[PDB]
């Protein structure tokens, strides 16, 4: 196991940022469970969301991938729960990590970017409107997210 991998486990593990766990899969260390409370005050408020992610091996210079497995009406999270976000992607660098990444995803359920996807229709109806959209994701939040 590379000496960072350790680290950032041991961290995650040890000194978890609050709503947020990460857990390896057994005997799959580049693999992780992630669970991310829904923040307050937002449609997504008392859900439990599960997501996964991996390091591939170029990993720390190619970022980890993430993805939702829990169902969620977001403009940034598509129906496959692929997450659009600048750090997972062109702005990712070696010096960010796996904390950063999920502190940005738990942020990102608070402050939804309508404008970063080319084609979701979810962001759409988030853009013209944003009340009306949180009806649909605080109903999804109780349906998909309460497990």
């Avoid at 923040?39 to 008392?46: F, L, N």
């Avoid at 979810?122 to 997210?145: C, G, L, P, S």
Wanted: proline content about 12%.
């Amino acid at each position: 196991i590379p000496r960072r991998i350790t680290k950032e486990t041991q961290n995650l593990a040890n000194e978890p940022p609050p709503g947020i766990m990460a857990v390896p899969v057994p005997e799959n260390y580049r693999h992780f469970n992630i669970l991310i409370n829904g923040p307050d005050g937002t449609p997504y408020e008392g859900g439990t969301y599960k997501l996964e992610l991996f390091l591939p091996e170029q990993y720390p210079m190619e970022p980890p991938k993430v993805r939702f497995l829990t169902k969620i009406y977001h403009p940034n999270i598509d129906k496959l729960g692929r997450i659009c976000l600048d750090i997972l992607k062109d702005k990712w660098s070696p010096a960010l990590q796996i904390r950063t990444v999920l502190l940005s995803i738990q942020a990102l359920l608070s402050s939804p970017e309508p404008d970063d996807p080319l084609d979701s229709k979810v962001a759409e109806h988030f853009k013209q409107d944003k009340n009306d959209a949180e009806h649909v994701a605080r109903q999804w939040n109780k349906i998909y997210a309460n497990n």
